[PDB]
Amino acid sequence: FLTAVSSIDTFLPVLNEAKLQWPTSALAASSEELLGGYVGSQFYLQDGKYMQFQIAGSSNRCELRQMIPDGGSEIGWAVDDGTTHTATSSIVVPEQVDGVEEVTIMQIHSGEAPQLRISWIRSKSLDGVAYEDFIMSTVRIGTGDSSDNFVKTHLADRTAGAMSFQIDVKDSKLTITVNGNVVVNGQDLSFWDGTDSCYFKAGAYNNNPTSESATARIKFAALAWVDHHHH
Numbered sequence: 001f002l003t004a005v006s007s008i009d010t011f012l013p014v015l016n017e018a019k020l021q022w023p024t025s026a027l028a029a030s031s032e033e034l035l036g037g038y039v040g041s042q043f044y045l046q047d048g049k050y051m052q053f054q055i056a057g058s059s060n061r062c063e064l065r066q067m068i069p070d071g072g073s074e075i076g077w078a079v080d081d082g083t084t085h086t087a088t089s090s091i092v093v094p095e096q097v098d099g100v101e102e103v104t105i106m107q108i109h110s111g112e113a114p115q116l117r118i119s120w121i122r123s124k125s126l127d128g129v130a131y132e133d134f135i136m137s138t139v140r141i142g143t144g145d146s147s148d149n150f151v152k153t154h155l156a157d158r159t160a161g162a163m164s165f166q167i168d169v170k171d172s173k174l175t176i177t178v179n180g181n182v183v184v185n186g187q188d189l190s191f192w193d194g195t196d197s198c199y200f201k202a203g204a205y206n207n208n209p210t211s212e213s214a215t216a217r218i219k220f221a222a223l224a225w226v227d228h229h230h231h
């Protein structure tokens, strides 16, 4: 039988601050249900250690969505509220099966758009350089569809071992740290000033697969939203 993620202590803080969306943005499990041992092939404890997400289908997901702690409702914060908003993770991204082309593993999202997606990418060219099997950031600086609405950055080549990430937002600027090294340093998020519906997400969100049957799979060794005010 599949072991529940809540069976160990490692993820209890974030599970107390998240709902699970699967296989779409529809609710799969409340925070209380997650802490109560919710489990399925889409969300289970692997190796007694990893919170593992799995999902197949274009634009489908198995993802945690940041909630107000202790049974609260959906959270919404703003890039310019003066507080530092921080998400941390340690992720083992396995080799992805054929047909999986891009898997979003962490986000900043709002009511209407993704401010940031950190994603594994099979193959893509950025600023004239071709990259394969790597982790990328995509930041929106507008809601348009043209390339000038995005800043896309190679963060790191995918590693077999765990890779640490940290996302920080403060005073309308974004920093991303990968394995302890700042890779994105103060990217401007001021386009989003005044949007008070932002929140963190993490898990697996499957983007533009070439087979809707192909199952994306992502293993978290650690995940947290870090509260700088210590509530």
Ligand SMILES: O=C(O)[C@H]1O[C@@H](O[C@H]2[C@H](O)[C@H](O)[C@H](O[C@H]3[C@H](O)[C@H](O)[C@@H](O)O[C@@H]3C(=O)O)O[C@@H]2C(=O)O)[C@@H](O)[C@@H](O)[C@@H]1O
Pocket: 114, 124, 125, 138, 140, 145, 146, 147, 150, 152, 207, 208
């Ligand atoms: O490689 C490129 O830069 C090409 O990307 C195209 O634009 C992307 C855009 O960068 C971004 O990745 C976007 O991401 C969406 C995602 O796939 C999901 O649909 C959902 O999360 O919503 C995201 C979003 O709307 O921001 O997808 C688009 C895309 O068109 O596929 C083009 O800009 C292309 O010209 C460019 O070469």
Ligand SMILES: O=C(O)[C@H]1O[C@@H](O[C@H]2[C@H](O)[C@H](O)[C@H](O[C@H]3[C@H](O)[C@H](O)[C@H](O)O[C@@H]3C(=O)O)O[C@H]2C(=O)O)[C@@H](O)[C@@H](O)[C@@H]1O
Pocket: 021, 024, 025, 026, 027, 065, 074, 109
């Ligand atoms: O297009 C998407 O799939 C986007 O969905 C987003 O989640 C939303 C979405 O509306 C979802 O159905 C659900 O909405 C709930 C939620 O409780 C909301 O606060 C409202 O009060 O009731 C809705 C309901 O009863 O269905 O969750 C929403 C949310 O913001 O959490 C995100 O998953 C996006 O990432 C996604 O692009």
